[PDB]
Design an enzyme around this catalytic site. Structure first.
Site, PDB file in Angstrom:
ATOM      1  N   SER A 105       0.376   2.391  -4.546  1.00 60.58           N
ATOM      2  CA  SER A 105      -0.432   1.656  -5.514  1.00 60.58           C
ATOM      3  C   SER A 105      -0.316   0.141  -5.351  1.00 60.58           C
ATOM      4  O   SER A 105      -0.993  -0.604  -6.068  1.00 60.58           O
ATOM      5  CB  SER A 105      -0.119   2.037  -6.942  1.00 60.58           C
TER       6      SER A 105
ATOM      7  N   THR B  77       3.816  -1.932  -8.863  1.00 60.19           N
ATOM      8  CA  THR B  77       4.567  -0.822  -8.315  1.00 60.19           C
ATOM      9  C   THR B  77       3.661   0.040  -7.445  1.00 60.19           C
ATOM     10  O   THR B  77       2.435  -0.124  -7.447  1.00 60.19           O
ATOM     11  CB  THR B  77       5.152   0.032  -9.449  1.00 60.19           C
TER      12      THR B  77
END
Length: 260
Positions: free
Chosen positions: A42, A207
């Site tokens: 991500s 993250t």
């Protein structure tokens, strides 16, 4: 000797570790497997939001543009877009949701708006990032298979990119500030780099998680005294069904900040 405890922490977790830190106060860097490729999961969404902001510089209305997505755009990990299905969401809101909740539907929507995967790659090329390559949409880009260069970058490249975008001159002023603001409002990052930093510091991070126990975090850190730090950490593991090791990212942060 940083080299060592990282080397150490890696074996201990039976993973592969890439680290790039850029201390912007003195020009110093710490680099660990930092030219090696790692599945970005991500973390690419950081690059994706910067790409939107780039575009928005020639499109005054783009950020308030209302997107009316259908039920079928929804994925497993789409908490915010799920929440706003009935009413839809602006481009800005979608950027926020993708940075701050890691919404995968918001990301896929933002890639269409931009003109597809290749538009994201071109944006990266435009700010001098040669290693970032987006190859698949959500959710297929989190396979993170060993030695698969799809949907990967290097810690060095991403650190350089985050520096340019958030601290340097790659974006225009308002956009650059917005990118920083999105990062500082992240909700997914408590257990990674944040957990390794002093609590009086200001942290903005994206993250990334995936198969092979892939646990990633890219951050800019604002220490109470001094100029900011860029820190990128990518970690991945042997088996496909590995459990994440967010602790490792916190441990790495502790090790790195102890030098400085």
């Amino acid at each position: 000797s940083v080299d060592k405890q990282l080397a150490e922490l890696e074996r201990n977790a039976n993973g592969r570790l890439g680290v790039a830190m850029i201390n912007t106060g003195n020009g110093t860097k710490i680099l660990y497997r930092a030219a090696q490729r790692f599945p970005f999961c991500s973390t690419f969404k950081f690059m994706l939001a910067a790409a939107v902001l780039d575009q928005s510089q020639s499109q005054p209305n783009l950020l308030n543009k209302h997107i009316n997505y259908h039920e079928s755009d929804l994925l497993s990990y789409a908490p915010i877009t799920r929440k706003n299905l009935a009413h839809g969401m602006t481009v800005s809101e979608l950027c926020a949701a993708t940075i701050q909740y890691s919404d995968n539907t918001a990301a896929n929507l933002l890639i269409k708006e931009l003109g597809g995967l290749a538009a994201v790659n071109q944006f990266a090329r435009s700010i001098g990032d040669q290693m970032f390559r987006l190859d698949r949409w959500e959710p297929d880009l989190n396979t993170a298979r060993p030695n698969d260069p799809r949907d990967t970058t290097t810690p060095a490249a991403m650190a350089a990119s985050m520096n340019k975008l958030v601290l340097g001159d790659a974006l225009r002023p308002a956009q650059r500030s917005q990118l920083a603001v999105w990062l500082k409002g992240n909700t997914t990052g408590d257990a990674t780099i944040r957990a390794g930093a002093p609590t009086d510091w200001i942290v903005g991070d994206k993250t990334g998680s995936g198969d092979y126990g892939t646990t990633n975090d890219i951050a800019v850190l604002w220490p109470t005294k001094g100029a900011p730090i860029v820190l990128v950490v990518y970690f991945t593991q042997r088996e496909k069904d590995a459990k994440p090791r967010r602790d490792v990212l916190a441990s790495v942060t502790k090790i790195i900040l102890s030098q400085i």
